[PDB]
Symmetry: D2
Subunit: 398 residues, 4 copies
């Protein structure tokens, strides 16, 4: 049915939402508001801007029109009411959590977390008297059992950093609705093109827009999407007062540029990673593979229900442990050795020998990290070139 109130499709909105060129001298690309302050015609229009009474701007840290279009567009893409743009992923996560939690509050966390998130919680906010508990968010019994009435927030990534462990977002939402908690999901890996946690009951979605959304590895940015009520608070307290993590209008404009090919890029990320994952499963050097699009995936059924495509990230374990991981990493000639993900260029990392090298093997097992675990951000290059590079590096891995 063609409809009068039917949403334009994802691609259309990623390109167009929230912008009419007619409102801006006909400019097809929005002009970039690289400006710190705005001006007032009088002080009555000025006082009304500080009140949230008129929808005109005063200062770029609080709100900016280039930033607003990005936020509006991202909110559309996630299906949410409102968006906030910030200087990084961590800036999104810290501004949100700082806003929502106070001493005595408890936050329930996914069992594994992105390292700096884990750092923010245990060495940052968790040292200012906020309580932390990890649970397996795929274990709805154990989550139910962990809830107190001090439980203010449930925060997780899905899929999660190390082995791609999923959580059942709607089943988690159900339990949060019962006890009255706020569910915050890091949707970095899937993006709104593949997973929309707000449509599954989550209250807030955070993103490292540094990754897939930008797509080209040339900005650092974060996004928060949720209801107006919550995002308004994160804007006026978390951002304004508590992190100062303001995104550049230059970078916001690059971000929107990237978002315009998001669907296209993700289709290719996913098509390439599928092929690569299936390659890796059949290789003698490989003990174990975690990829949502392989049938062997433990949470395969949950992956097809809550994500429309299995994603661009692969984690696998080399048989020969840390030495094998090192040699594999040092052999790659197309894949680059780097932290980060979601660029056009394929990336790889081996926490045992990189990010987490100055731990012991036993302390790595504590954080879900195998000695042979290698993570791949499969990029947009030709798959035959990527297979040739991976095959050659597997040989060198012995």
């Amino acid at each position: 049915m063609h409809g009068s109130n039917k949403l334009p499709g994802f691609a259309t909105r990623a390109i167009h939402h929230g912008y009419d060129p007619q409102d801006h001298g006909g400019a097809l690309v929005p002009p970039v508001y690289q400006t710190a302050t705005f001006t007032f015609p009088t002080v009555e229009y000025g006082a009304a801007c500080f009140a949230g009474e008129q929808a005109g701007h005063f200062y770029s840290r609080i709100s900016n029109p280039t930033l607003n279009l990005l936020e509006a567009r991202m909110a559309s893409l996630e299906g949410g009411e409102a968006g906030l743009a910030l200087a990084s992923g961590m800036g999104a996560i810290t501004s949100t959590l700082w806003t929502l939690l106070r001493p005595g509050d408890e936050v329930l966390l996914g069992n594994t977390l992105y390292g700096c998130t884990f750092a923010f919680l245990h060495h940052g906010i968790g040292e200012f008297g906020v309580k932390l508990r990890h649970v397996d968010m795929a274990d709805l019994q154990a989550l139910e059992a962990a809830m107190t009435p001090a439980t203010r927030v449930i925060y997780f990534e899905s899929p999660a950093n190390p082995n791609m462990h999923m959580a059942d977002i709607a089943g988690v939402a159900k339990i949060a609705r019962k006890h009255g908690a706020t569910v915050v999901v890091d949707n970095t890996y899937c993006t709104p093109y593949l997973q929309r946690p707000l449509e599954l009951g989550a209250d807030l979605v955070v993103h490292s827009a540094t990754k897939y959304l930008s797509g080209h590895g040339d900005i650092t940015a974060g996004i928060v999407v949720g209801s107006q009520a919550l995002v308004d608070r994160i804007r006026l307290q978390g951002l304004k007062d508590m992190t100062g993590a303001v995104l550049s209008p230059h970078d916001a404009a690059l971000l929107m540029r990237g978002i315009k090919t998001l669907n296209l890029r993700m289709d290719r990320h996913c098509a390439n990673a599928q092929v690569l994952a299936e390659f890796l499963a059949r290789q003698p050097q490989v003990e174990l593979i975690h990829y949502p699009g392989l049938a062997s995936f433990p949470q395969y059924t949950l992956a097809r229900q809550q994500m429309s495509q299995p994603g661009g990230m692969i984690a696998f374990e080399l048989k020969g442990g840390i030495g094998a991981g090192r040699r594999f990493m040092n052999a790659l000639q197309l894949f680059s050795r780097a932290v980060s993900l979601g660029d056009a260029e394929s990336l790889a990392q081996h926490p045992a020998s990189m990010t987490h090298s100055s731990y012991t093997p036993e302390e790595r097992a504590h954080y879900g990290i195998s000695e042979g675990l290698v993570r791949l951000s499969v990029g947009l290059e030709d798959i035959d070139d990527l297979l040739a590079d991976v095959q050659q590096a597997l040989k060198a891995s012995a």
Copy 2:
């Protein structure tokens, strides 16, 4: 008589410090390192990059060569050991204090702060079990009388926002050294061209680079300068984990561009501001007037000790109260009605009918804010046009 590569002068260093073109293909202006991530030649090289050895970049949130140049240069200008660059002034202050303070520690503050510093403190970090206390930082006895063994940090501005109130920085530092407290000075209004708190005994300096250091009103940014020990902590804890206020390499490059004219612009700001404050002082409509370069200024002796020039900001209180504020502000044709300062274009605000418009006269009294107070950021325009515009707007304020 000191010569042979002596310490180069302030202008020279503002243009050249930390950069020889021969190390980047002869490029006179350093290339902008607008990249999120960096690559390693081996995994072992990368083990060293997170561990602190063979340092040379993994991820722009922690560090980036464009930012490193800015940081080093601002360190040279302030005479500190190390710099840090962030997404905003608030980014600098929050990252600093989040790092230095924990529940049970106390911090002492100047009587009046920048609005959001004040809001961070009372409604942010204060609500996380950190004790706050306001002293007059010109009164060395009163400061001594507030010290406790839990006092970890002394934070203030000088001059400070409303009335241009100075602190005896050398005096505060002596006390702080006895007590093991860290002194953090917000040096935004002066910049290192006019005042260098580290040479007077402060430990850390912070800036809204949004203002004078950028000078052109097109970026939001902050800086921190101080000891390697303190800055390494602020970088690796406050910024990496607690704020995520990452500065865009693009804007960091505009900031370096602004710094290149800093002496020249500050000379002009100060020359324009002098003429205007002498003018305003001879005016029937103008009650009191707060400019450090008037002989009448209460702390004239302290200000000439700490500041090489009297600044670019004027505060004056008007006889007609709020009504005369509104008429004066709405009458300006050259000065712009906006918050912010240190821009090429002259700015004017009047908190009674704008920033603090719905606070009613009493809560305003408890912050230093007179009902007729008008703040001027004097800009770079021709002094005669600026005179004419103030002239004309006093007439209409009756």
Copy 3:
């Protein structure tokens, strides 16, 4: 057939060719050389760079590393020896022809041309002693018969901008071997992803990089690719001395950003256009459709033979004439009315009522422009939304 002598795939080279992060501090994305000028370690290493005896820059109007990477990359994608980046499409075209022609030389031109190319030739260089001859370049017998000993250059677009008329590039190149002319093809419409004239025997290719190569409509740029000797000549005469059409490094970086999704965007442009064009052919009001992908296209077999895909451009003819054209255009809610093409946003133009409405109905006819001629640049939106917009607007056409 493994082995390192294999050419990497087009998408790999669009992302990586000519750049190794290791040579620039690990920066995954190359730093932007936003610098006018370059420096020398000695006056002797200076004397080498002006002569071309040493690899090194001196001045970004002649040469700059950000541009040089863009150039090397475009050369690889077209399969030429060398490239040159310029401030616009017309910068590439004029820099080329100013370099190659002198009074007395003849240039054979394709029968229709881009309006501004046409204007340059007849009202510009043509008025300076260079003779012009139009010829049907799809008619090899006629082209042979037009050659004369004064013929220096054969220049054309394929497909050609208005009606998608095409020329046999291998056929033209072979006539040009025989007589001695230099063949230059404007390959804007296809990009190197779809058509590679150098590989079919052309000497030089030019682009409006403003269109598809950029893909996102935020920049104005041009590219020449050809033999080292011809491009060097165009660099050092046409660009340096005769146009000054220097590309901003910033923009060159955006163009490299756009090229990273070129194959992905072209695939989607083309799929969307195939679907739209089939629809347009089945519809009452359409007199005559022209799309290379439909069998009714007069040079169907030639298109199939020189282009890997039929492209993103459609021209059709409404039955109601000039009036039905204005009516359809004004009815568009998603397609935007504007000149240009190869954006993510779909564009529509109607010369009789827009670009060529200054003219009379019979002067439009001299240039091959029907009265109901509508041109569509099909973008990357969801095809269903674009179908609906064009369905909706065909109704409004009676």
Copy 4:
């Protein structure tokens, strides 16, 4: 004095002219229209737009709102009717001359020209039938005798890129008026802040905005200022059709940023320059010195008549010829060895061993280039550091 048609001073206009923040949501700094194309609300609005009725925009190569701001501001600064922004100084020169010259026309030229301008004239437009004669533009008898009916343009720099030879601009205009000829002056060295050739009777002014206007060595740009009717033709023929030398809106915004400190930088460039000149003029290693601000300067009087300050450029000749100049350049440690000028960083060049190194001693003396001629672009650094560096390089010049 005060009259209602009052003109704001140079610095005010450089910062404000042609922009009201109220016309763009209050944005203190103008938004950057980084867009290639522009949209129409109806087909008819666009029709009356290409035609020139209605003040809207269609394509950024023709015209762009950011560029038009820069163009109005530069027009104001030079006291001319209309402005044009281009990709480089050469862009402006060529776009100008290709508009006004045709085969058989004569252009009369100052005796010496910037090498690239000379190259354009002799090896470019001059090889298309345009006649060239060089004449001394200070000798008015010689110029009157040089005039012919073919003489359509008189083009020169003043001061001129040799030896700072000046032209009698008002004298020249009086002779050109007698014969209908168009006088175009390259005012790069002075900028409008120091010389306003249009006020002395010139028709058109050209600028490499790459130099002092930008001030910071980070862009390549050109400006033309003159009468509405000439500029229009240069835009709609030279720019649009004959060079395609389109300025990036981003670089245009950086150039506006630079112009905001033009007075202030030029004041310092000249004060540093006056100091090095008075020093250099007393050194035994130094034969001759060409600086307008020395009393011994042959054209002292004319210089002071056209120019409010003597400029930031110095040329001198070392007694020891080619080897002296080589040893001097090589010894420099603050001054950079580079071509270009008008940067905040001080630059120096020695044509005999650099630009014109490949040439012979007799061919250099033919263009007025001594074997020992050194040219300094005096920068904004501390004059004491600059003195020490020139000093030390003078001692090594033995």
